[PDB]
């Protein structure tokens, strides 16, 4: 039982607790997840698990090939104080041809049957212009990863109409009010019934049967009884709660329920949860009782429909066509979301035909994996397990590198699962247990939601517990260490915040508190949650500070615990309270996806998606990007504390940080690319109009936006005169670098548009699961990606945007200044 107490603290929630359930679905899931855990445990190669090689099968891009010399990769190998360099061909395997080679300063290994060109660490060095420093080391013992040993009427024979008794609602404290009861499947309301309005007192009783038109034999599995409370005095939603009509054992839900409801403040994933509100003492409750072959024009119309984006709404006509031409639609994997949205789920014979249809998915099974298409099947529009499972079926072929690219949003998509035990939850379980890097991030992503989502903490806790019981003792200790450190640091972060430029007493107290944590509480070393390779050590109390800001975040710097670390660079972590860093995580992850897209078209845009992990309610950690300052500061340094800005200061800031001409122009080139990435990426994501104290530049030219979890003459993005002066453009001219900037944006924008469907789905999912949203909010990226339009035309559009900034110059940057 002591092991369970550890799990609870690691998880941040008590999975054995049953104080907020009305059935045993959670416990059933615990027991259900035992098998796929042990299958993965018993199957993983202990030695490859222990070393967790971070590897990709993608080609090395054109931008990384043209950085090689005569098919030669230099790899410095170390012993104790040995440093002997080797000539290696890209195709050389480490655990054979290089003769375990751990990376210097990192928990990262160049091992296994893949060439060195295909290790992400090696590609990381090639990109930045660094060298491959490895250390001959003993392999880490797989015994350390050891895992603690463990231990009657049919539904389709029931033509009776479904009914639910609304006994009444009850609220301790506090105009009229009524109950709406929807049978839902996906976001689709199948059947809706309301009560009569009554006066809104602390108790309202109806004692009324709501008889629905849908038959019990017609309720599809995963149908939700969605109970909602509205008020008049033109109504308004005030509370909601859901109840699965068919439970986890395929039994029709039967009997008395007192469901504690959620309060409002709309596609928001929280609306879909089957979790009841656990705050029984303040929350509105509701009491219920359940006691129960084609023509040519048609082909072209069908093809036009199949070709539209995931946010083009299907008409009744559209759906009827897809459904009638079911089998022709089944030949086109891109049709699948629309076809399955053309299914009348409230009709048992249609669902049966849909299931027949699903048994003929040769073309789907044979199709190359499209993540975009696959993600759409995992969104809120699909509640059927068999549809959703063909989505997860395709995810199974993702190599680990790609799982990590999509992990955050795969974890978020668990929120769209009807049941706690799902093919998706088990896929994430499986892939996390097969790979320590996936498992590490799975821990934190799951934990991020467990700590601040009442709506989904129970589900995620069960999944996280199931992961933890298979990750192996080493990772348990390891995770335990990390949680203890962030709890210590979050405490210091919050305490300093209460004590409010940063005054004398603040700078005094912080450093004492850091010195007090250092001397007793803090461990020898711990893993950096956002960069599991890096192990942090002792604080550099010297270098730690608090921002002259209203949120008063902590800038912390640590020593690297790893003696074999080559640099002297500290590990920098910002701890901040006040911002919802879930939104940042999501945006930063989409920026990583955008980078991998660009990579497929051999385009680098040098984005800087810095590490960020939400650890709790409005709280978390941000990776310190070293040698960087804000653009706003670069203007204040030369111009003044509070004044509007001059065009030359950024370029002449860049100049004064660049030592040689070789490294300066590099900075300017790096900046042209960087500026282009963020102009395209922020435009697409609709977060481009930012005050320049939320844009940053490195000493080596790399522009990057920060502080995403925030967001009248406007601007599509930020391409200010100071950015344009670095390119060399005095108001209305055209430099060589600017035409190249214009060049790069266009190719980047068109590159994103080639994955339009993927981006639309990730943007939709982002809004639904991390931004508490409307259809019109979601439909921004359609316009941003100029859906339906041609290359030439989308290119004009984007150039027109580049010029909108030019027309405005400084007006919005300055209009912020006044506001702020
Ligand atoms: C580094 C910096 N330069 C100029 C202006 C502000 C900052 C800065 N200072 C901070 C302090 Cl003193 C404490 C806590 C957080 C701070 C954040 C910043 C800047 C605004 N942001 C970042 N600075 C460095 N790395 C980052 N990664 C993500 N965001 C950043």
Spell out the SS3 assignment of 78-139. ECCCCCEEEEECCCCCCCCCCCCEEECCCCCEECCCCCHHHEHHHHHHHHHCCCEEEEECCC
Taking each helix axis as running N to C, give the angle between helix 581-600 and helix 661-685, from 0 to 180 degrees, rounded to the nearest 10: 110
Ligand-binding site membership of 640 (annotated):
no
Resolution to 1 decimal, in Å?
2.4
Residue listed under structure tokens 């111009």: 639
The whole-angstrom distance between residue 421's C-alpha and the CA centroid of its chain comes to 21
Distance separating alpha carbons of residues 63 and 127, to the nearest angstrom: 8
Taking CA atoms, 115 is separated from 99, 104, 110, 122, 139, in Å, by: 14, 19, 9, 10, 19
User: Cβ contacts of residue 730 below 8 Å, gap of 6+?
Assistant: 647
Structure tokens at 113: 């049957």
Taking residue 663's Cβ as centre, other Cβ atoms within 10 Å add up to 14
**697 half-sphere exposure, CB direction, 13 A CA radius:** 28
Distance separating alpha carbons of residues 749 and 141, to the nearest angstrom: 47
Please answer whether residues 400 and 52 qualify as being in contact, where contact means their C-beta atoms are separated by less than 8 angstroms: no
Taking CA atoms, 277 is separated from 280, 291, 455, 456, in Å, by: 7, 24, 7, 10
Residue 201 is classified by DSSP as: -
Atom of ligand 1 nearest to the CA of 625: 25
Please answer whether residues 193 and 212 qualify as being in contact, where contact means their C-beta atoms are separated by less than 8 angstroms: yes
Structure tokens at 630: 């804000």
**CB burial string 512-530: b at 16+ within 10 A, e below:** ebbeebeeeebeebbbbbb
Structural domains of the chain, ranges and CATH numbers in brackets: 1-151 (3.10.20.90), 157-292 (2.60.40.150), 293-472 (1.25.40.70), 473-626 (3.30.1010.10), 627-814 (1.10.1070.11)
Best CA proximity match to 288, nearest among 226, 373, 231? 226
Q: Helices marked H in 359-435 — which ranges?
A: 362-366, 371-376, 385-395, 400-413, 423-434
Ligand-binding site membership of 575 (annotated):
yes
The whole-angstrom distance between residue 380's C-alpha and the CA centroid of its chain comes to 16
Mutate to test the pocket of ligand 1, among 507, 573, 628 (most ligand atoms within 8 A of CB): 628
Residue listed under structure tokens 């860049």: 654
Distance separating alpha carbons of residues 269 and 455, to the nearest angstrom: 9
288: phi then psi, degrees, rounded to nearest 5: -130, 165
Structure tokens at 181: 């009861």
Residue 252 is classified by DSSP as: B
671: phi then psi, degrees, rounded to nearest 5: -75, -35
Distance separating alpha carbons of residues 598 and 614, to the nearest angstrom: 27
Distance separating alpha carbons of residues 60 and 250, to the nearest angstrom: 49
- Ligand 1 center–CA 609 separation, angstroms: 14
Burial category of 20 from C-beta neighbours within 10 Å (exposed 0-12, middle 13-18, buried 19 and up): middle
Taking CA atoms, 254 is separated from 222, 244, 513, in Å, by: 15, 11, 56
Mutate to test the pocket of ligand 1, among 706, 707, 820 (most ligand atoms within 8 A of CB): 706
Taking CA atoms, 525 is separated from 76, 518, 535, 556, in Å, by: 26, 11, 6, 15
- Helices (H), strands (E): how many in the chain? 30, 25
C-alpha dihedral (486, 491, 497, 499), degrees to nearest 10: -150
Q: Does the beta carbon of 556 sit less than 6 angstroms from any atom of ligand 1?
A: no
- Ligand 1 center–CA 160 separation, angstroms: 64
Q: Residues 426, 428, 431, 433: is their CA dihedral positive or negative?
A: negative
- Catalogue the long-range contacts made by 151-157 (C-beta closer than 8 Å, 24 or more residues apart): 155/216, 155/217, 155/219, 155/246, 155/250, 155/252, 156/217, 156/348, 157/217
Taking CA atoms, 34 is separated from 27, 41, 326, 341, 512, in Å, by: 11, 10, 38, 33, 47
Strand 545-546, strand 236-244: pairing? unpaired
The whole-angstrom distance between residue 661's C-alpha and the CA centroid of its chain comes to 40
- Ligand 1 center–CA 378 separation, angstroms: 37
- Ligand 1 center–CA 575 separation, angstroms: 11
- Ligand 1 center–CA 626 separation, angstroms: 9
Concatenated DSSP letters of 48-89: HHHH---B--SPPPHHHHTT-BTTBEEEEEESSS--EEEEE-
Distance separating alpha carbons of residues 756 and 648, to the nearest angstrom: 37
Taking each helix axis as running N to C, give the angle between helix 791-808 and helix 661-685, from 0 to 180 degrees, rounded to the nearest 10: 110
Q: Does the beta carbon of 610 sit less than 6 angstroms from any atom of ligand 1?
A: yes
Taking CA atoms, 398 is separated from 58, 79, 215, 370, 403, in Å, by: 12, 36, 41, 10, 6
User: Cβ contacts of residue 450 below 8 Å, gap of 6+?
Assistant: 11, 12, 13, 457, 460, 461, 464
Question: Where are the strands (E) in 594-702, listed by range?
Answer: 612-616, 619-623, 628-630, 695-698
Ligand-binding site membership of 250 (annotated):
no
Taking residue 507's Cβ as centre, other Cβ atoms within 10 Å add up to 14
Mutate to test the pocket of ligand 1, among 493, 501, 555 (most ligand atoms within 8 A of CB): 555
Best CA proximity match to 465, nearest among 24, 18, 2, 37? 37
Distance separating alpha carbons of residues 751 and 757, to the nearest angstrom: 12
Distance separating alpha carbons of residues 491 and 522, to the nearest angstrom: 13
């Amino acid at each position: 039982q002591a092991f369970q107490r550890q799990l609870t603290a690691l998880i941040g929630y008590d999975v054995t607790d049953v104080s907020n359930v009305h059935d045993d679905e959670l416990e059933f899931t615990r027991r259900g997840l035992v098998t796929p855990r042990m299958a993965e445990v018993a199957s993983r190669d202990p030695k490859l698990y222990a070393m967790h090689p971070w590897v990709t099968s993608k080609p090395l891009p054109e931008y990384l090939w043209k950085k090689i010399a005569n098919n030669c990769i230099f790899i410095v190998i170390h012993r104790s104080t040995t440093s002997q360099t080797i000539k290696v061909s890209p195709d050389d395997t480490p655990g054979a041809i290089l003769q375990v080679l751990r990376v210097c300063g990192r928990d990262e290994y160049l091992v296994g049957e893949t060439p060195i060109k295909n290790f992400q660490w090696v590609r990381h060095c090639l990109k930045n212009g660094e060298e491959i420093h490895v250390v001959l080391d003993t392999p880490p013992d797989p015994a350390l990863d050891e895992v603690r040993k463990e231990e009657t009427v049919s539904l389709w024979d029931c033509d009776r109409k479904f009914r639910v008794k609304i006994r009444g609602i009850d609220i301790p404290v506090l105009l009229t009010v009524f109950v709406e009861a929807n049978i839902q499947h996906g976001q689709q309301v199948l059947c809706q019934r309301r009560t009569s309005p009554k006066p809104f007192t602390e108790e309202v009783l109806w004692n009324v049967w709501l008889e629905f038109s849908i038959k019990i034999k017609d309720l599809p599995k995963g149908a939700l009884l969605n109970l909602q409370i509205y008020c008049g005095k033109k109504v308004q939603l005030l509370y909601y709660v859901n109840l699965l009509l068919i439970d986890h054992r395929f039994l029709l839900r039967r009997g008395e329920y007192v469901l504690h409801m959620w309060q409002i403040s709309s596609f928001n994933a929280d609306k879909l949860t089957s979790a009841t509100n656990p705050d029984k003492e303040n929350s509105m409750s509701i009491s219920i009782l359940l006691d129960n072959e084609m023509p040519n024009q048609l082909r072209k119309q069908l093809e036009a429909i199949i070709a539209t984006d995931p946010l083009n709404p299907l008409t009744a006509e559209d759906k009827e066509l897809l459904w009638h031409f079911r089998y022709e639609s089944l030949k086109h994997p891109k049709a699948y979301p629309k076809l399955f949205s053309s299914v009348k789920w409230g009709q048992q014979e249609i669902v049966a035909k849909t299931y027949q249809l699903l048994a003929r998915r040769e073309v789907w099974d044979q199709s190359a994996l499209d993540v975009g298409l696959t993600m759409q099947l995992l969104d809120c529009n699909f509640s059927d397990e068999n549809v959703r499972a063909i989505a997860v079926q395709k995810l199974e072929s993702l190599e680990d590198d790609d799982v990590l690219h999509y992990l955050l949003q795969l974890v978020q998509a668990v929120k769209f699962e009807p049941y706690h035990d799902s093919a998706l939850a088990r896929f994430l379980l499986k892939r996390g247990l097969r790979n320590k890097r996936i498992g590490h991030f799975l821990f934190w992503f799951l934990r991020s939601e467990i700590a601040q989502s009442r709506h989904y903490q129970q589900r995620f806790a069960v999944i996280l517990e199931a992961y933890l019981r298979g990750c192996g003792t080493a990772m348990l200790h390891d995770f335990t260490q990390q949680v203890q450190v962030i709890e210590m640091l979050q405490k210091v972060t919050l305490d300093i915040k209460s004590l409010s430029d940063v005054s004398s007493q603040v700078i005094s107290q912080l450093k004492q508190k850091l010195e007090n944590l250092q001397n007793s509480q803090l461990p020898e070393s711990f893993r950096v949650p956002y960069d599991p390779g890096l192990k942090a050590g002792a604080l550099a109390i010297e270098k730690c500070k608090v921002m002259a800001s209203k949120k008063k975040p902590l800038w912390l710097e640590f020593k690297c615990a790893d003696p074999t670390a080559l640099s002297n660079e500290t590990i920098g972590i910002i701890f901040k309270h006040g911002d919802d860093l879930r939104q940042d995580m999501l945006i930063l992850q989409i920026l990583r996806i955008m980078e991998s897209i660009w990579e497929t078209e051999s385009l680098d845009l040098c984005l800087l998606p810095y590490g960020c992990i939400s650890t709790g309610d409005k709280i978390g950690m941000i990776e310190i990007v070293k040698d960087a300052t804000t653009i706003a500061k670069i203007q204040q340094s030369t111009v003044g504390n509070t004044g509007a800005f001059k065009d030359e200061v950024l370029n002449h800031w860049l100049k004064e940080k660049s030592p040689t001409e070789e490294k300066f122009q590099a900075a300017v080139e790096r900046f042209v690319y960087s500026c282009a990435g963020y102009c395209v990426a922020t435009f697409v994501l609709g977060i481009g109009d930012r005050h320049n104290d939320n844009i940053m530049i490195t000493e080596t030219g790399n522009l990057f936006h920060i502080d995403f979890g925030h967001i009248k003459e406007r601007v599509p993005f930020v391409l200010t005169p100071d950015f344009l002066f670095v390119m060399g453009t005095s108001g209305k001219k055209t430099s060589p670098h600017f035409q190249k900037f214009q060049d790069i944006c266009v190719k980047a924008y068109l590159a994103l548009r080639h994955h339009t469907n993927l981006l639309i789905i990730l943007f939709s999912m982002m809004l639904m699961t991390g931004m508490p949203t409307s259809k019109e909010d979601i439909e921004y990226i359609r316009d941003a990606l100029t859906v339906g339009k041609n290359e030439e035309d989308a290119k004009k559009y984007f150039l027109d945007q580049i010029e909108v900034c030019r027309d405005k110059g400084w007006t919005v940057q300055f209009n912020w200044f006044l506001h702020l």
